[PDB]
Amino acid sequence: MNFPTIDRSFFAGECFDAYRVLGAHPCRDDFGQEGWRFAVWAPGAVAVEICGGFDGWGPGVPMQKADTGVWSGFVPGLAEGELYKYRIHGKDGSTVMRADPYAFSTELRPGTASRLARMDFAFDDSSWMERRDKCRNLPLNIYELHAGSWKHKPNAGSDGWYNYRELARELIPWLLDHRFTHVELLPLAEHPFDGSWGYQTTGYFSVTSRYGDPADFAAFVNACHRMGIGVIMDFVPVHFAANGDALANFDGTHLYEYDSSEWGTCNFNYYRREVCSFLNSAAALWMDVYHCDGIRMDAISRALYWQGDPNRGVNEGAVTFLRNLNHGLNERWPTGIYTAEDSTNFLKVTAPTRYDGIGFDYKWDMGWMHDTLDYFATPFGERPDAYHKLTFSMQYFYNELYLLALSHDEVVHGKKTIIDKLWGTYEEKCAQLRTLYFYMYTHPGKKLNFMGNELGHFREWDEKKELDWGLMKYPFHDSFQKYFAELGRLYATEPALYDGEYNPNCFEWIACESRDEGVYAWLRKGAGQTILCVMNTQNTAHKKFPLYFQYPCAADELLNSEAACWNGADRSRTRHLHTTDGGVYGRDYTLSVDLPAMGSRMYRITPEA
Distance between CA atoms of residues 227 and 172, nearest Å:
8
Distance between CA atoms of residues 39 and 380, nearest Å:
63
Q: After which residues is the chain broken (C to N over 2.5 A)?
A: 156, 260
Ramachandran assignment for 179, one of left (phi > 0), alpha (psi -120 to 50 degrees), beta (any other)? left
Q: Which residues pair with 545 in a beta bridge?
A: 593
Q: Report helix, strand or coil for 560.
A: strand
Distance between CA atoms of residues 469 and 425, nearest Å:
23
Torsion of CA 192, 198, 201, 203, to 10 degrees: 80
Distance between CA atoms of residues 604 and 557, nearest Å:
6
Burial class (CB in 10 A: 0-12, 13-18, 19+), 394: middle
For 413, other C-beta atoms within 10 Å of its C-beta total 9
Of 530, 518, 509, residue with least CA distance to 387: 518
Sign of CA dihedral 263, 212, 154, 141: positive
Distance between CA atoms of residues 238 and 479, nearest Å:
41
Torsion of CA 10, 12, 15, 20, to 10 degrees: -10
Cα 334 from chain centroid (whole Å): 18
The interaxial angle of helices 164-178 and 214-226, nearest 10 deg, is 20
- The residues, any chain, with a CB within 8 Å of residue 131's CB and separated by 6 or more, are none
- The residues, any chain, with a CB within 8 Å of residue 55's CB and separated by 6 or more, are 61
Distance between CA atoms of residues 146 and 356, nearest Å:
34
Distance between CA atoms of residues 49 and 27, nearest Å:
19
Residue 600 contacts residue 535 (beta carbons within 8 Å):
yes
Distance between CA atoms of residues 31 and 251, nearest Å:
32
Residue 342 contacts residue 350 (beta carbons within 8 Å):
no
C-alpha distances out from residue 480 to 182, 416, 435, 456, 485, Å? 20, 18, 11, 7, 9
- The residues, any chain, with a CB within 8 Å of residue 243's CB and separated by 6 or more, are 192, 202
Residue 476 contacts residue 430 (beta carbons within 8 Å):
yes
Q: What's the CATH code, domain 9-115? A: 2.60.40.10
Of 535, 551, 596, 605, residue with least CA distance to 577: 605
Instruction: Confirm whether 298 is a catalytic residue.
Output: yes
Half-sphere exposure (Cβ direction) of 600: Cα atoms closer than 13 Å: 28
Residue 200 contacts residue 118 (beta carbons within 8 Å):
no
Report DSSP letters for 168-234, one per residue: HHHHHHHHHHHT--EEEEPP-EE-S-GGGTT-S-SEEEEE-GGG--HHHHHHHHHHHHHTT-EEEEE
Helix, strand, coil tally for the chain in percent (to 5): 30, 25, 45
Of 138, 49, 37, residue with least CA distance to 88: 49
H/E element, 225 = helix 214-226
φ, ψ for residue 604, nearest 5 deg: -75, 130
Half-sphere exposure (Cβ direction) of 368: Cα atoms closer than 13 Å: 29
Report DSSP letters for 358-420, one per residue: ---SEEE-HHHHHHHHHHHTS-GGGTGGGTHHHHTHHHHGGGTTEEEEE-GGGSSTTS--HHH
Half-sphere exposure (Cβ direction) of 581: Cα atoms closer than 13 Å: 1
Where helices occur in 65-157 by DSSP H, the ranges are 126-131
H/E element, 542 = strand 542-549
Burial class (CB in 10 A: 0-12, 13-18, 19+), 395: exposed
Torsion of CA 24, 28, 31, 34, to 10 degrees: 90
Distance between CA atoms of residues 461 and 402, nearest Å:
25
- The residues, any chain, with a CB within 8 Å of residue 120's CB and separated by 6 or more, are none
Residue in 293, 298, 486, 499 annotated catalytic? 298
Residue 405 contacts residue 450 (beta carbons within 8 Å):
no
Distance between CA atoms of residues 1 and 315, nearest Å:
42
Distance between CA atoms of residues 301 and 315, nearest Å:
10
Distance between CA atoms of residues 409 and 198, nearest Å:
13
Ramachandran assignment for 499, one of left (phi > 0), alpha (psi -120 to 50 degrees), beta (any other)? beta
Which approach determined this entry? X-ray
C-alpha distances out from residue 52 to 33, 85, 210, Å? 19, 6, 21
Instruction: Confirm whether 341 is a catalytic residue.
Output: yes
For 507, other C-beta atoms within 10 Å of its C-beta total 19
Cα 530 from chain centroid (whole Å): 30
Q: What is the 3-state secondary structure (H, E, C) of 321-348?
A: HHHHHHHHHHHHCCCCEEEECCCCCCCC
Burial class (CB in 10 A: 0-12, 13-18, 19+), 586: exposed
Residue 19 contacts residue 286 (beta carbons within 8 Å):
no
Residue 542 contacts residue 594 (beta carbons within 8 Å):
yes
Residue 357 contacts residue 315 (beta carbons within 8 Å):
no
Distance between CA atoms of residues 14 and 269, nearest Å:
15
At position 84, the amino acid (one-letter code) is Y
Beta strands 294-297 and 230-235 are parallel
Q: Report helix, strand or coil for 241.
A: strand
Q: Which CATH number fits domain 142-498: 3.20.20.80, 1.20.1250.20, 3.40.50.300, 3.30.1490.20?
A: 3.20.20.80
Biggest CA-to-CA distance, the chain: 92
Q: Tell me the domain boundaries of the chain.
A: 9-115, 142-498, 504-607
- The residues, any chain, with a CB within 8 Å of residue 204's CB and separated by 6 or more, are 101, 102, 189, 240, 278, 279, 282, 285
Distance between CA atoms of residues 456 and 429, nearest Å:
10
Q: Report helix, strand or coil for 83.
A: strand
Compute the residue count for the chain: 609
* Same fold: 9-115 with 504-607: yes
Half-sphere exposure (Cβ direction) of 287: Cα atoms closer than 13 Å: 26
Distance between CA atoms of residues 423 and 559, nearest Å:
24
For 157, other C-beta atoms within 10 Å of its C-beta total 13
Q: Which residues pair with 546 in a beta bridge?
A: 592
Distance between CA atoms of residues 251 and 65, nearest Å:
13
Beta strands 519-524 and 531-536 are antiparallel
Q: Which residues pair with 340 in a beta bridge?
A: 363
φ, ψ for residue 203, nearest 5 deg: -125, 85
Distance between CA atoms of residues 585 and 321, nearest Å:
54
Q: What is the 3-state secondary structure (H, E, C) of 479-537?
A: HHHHHHHHHHHHHHHCHHHHCCCCCHHHEEEEEEEECCCCEEEEEECHHHCCEEEEEEC
Residue in 274, 293, 341, 494 annotated catalytic? 341
Q: Report helix, strand or coil for 251.
A: coil
Of 88, 116, 21, 25, residue with least CA distance to 248: 88
Distance between CA atoms of residues 360 and 570, nearest Å:
43
Q: What's the CATH code, domain 504-607? A: 2.60.40.1180
Report DSSP letters for 283-316, one per residue: HHHHHHTS--SEEEETTTHHHHBGGG-GGG-B-H
Distance between CA atoms of residues 208 and 204, nearest Å:
10
Of 178, 141, 230, 183, residue with least CA distance to 447: 141
Rg of the chain over Cα atoms, rounded to whole angstroms, equals: 27
Residue 605 contacts residue 579 (beta carbons within 8 Å):
no
